[PDB]
Amino acid sequence: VNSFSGYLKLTDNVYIKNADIVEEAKKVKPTVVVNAANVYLKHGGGVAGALNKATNNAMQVESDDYIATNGPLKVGGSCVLSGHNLAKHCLHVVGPNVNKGEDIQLLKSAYENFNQHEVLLAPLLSAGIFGADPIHSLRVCVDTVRTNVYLAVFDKNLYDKLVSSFL
């Protein structure tokens, strides 16, 4: 038993809710919240900008030190950093950005990072401003992630569409 509430169960291990991932993280304080990161960990907008804003920019300060030491992530890759006031840890995962021409097949590689964590609160990778089809992203999630994932979908209209079209 865990503390996530109000989720619809899609499969053995995937759950979904219409929620703002920032407020969901603030209440649950999960072990892992996933950020929709880019390779530079520049958290300017979308999920990343909202998560970073909720940390009062501490996420960005930590991220800048990470990049200065390690260089950029790979598309499809990830790193574990602090969750600040939102979670124990933040798993920064880089899905392909269709608005940058990145290969959508890298979406499966991105979701594989979730398997290193037993339970996660996460957004749909490559959705929103990353320009992928959220329905495809949900399918890849279900077919790739084997650990327990609680998906937060900010847009109520989108949430209803993902549920109604789920196979």
Ligand SMILES: O=C(O)Cc1ccc(CNC(=O)c2ccnc3ccsc23)cc1
């Ligand atoms: O919700 C988030 O977590 C981030 C986010 C993703 C997408 C949109 C735009 N809406 C849609 O793409 C959309 C809305 C309703 N039906 C469909 C069907 C195929 S796409 C689609 C806004 C926010």
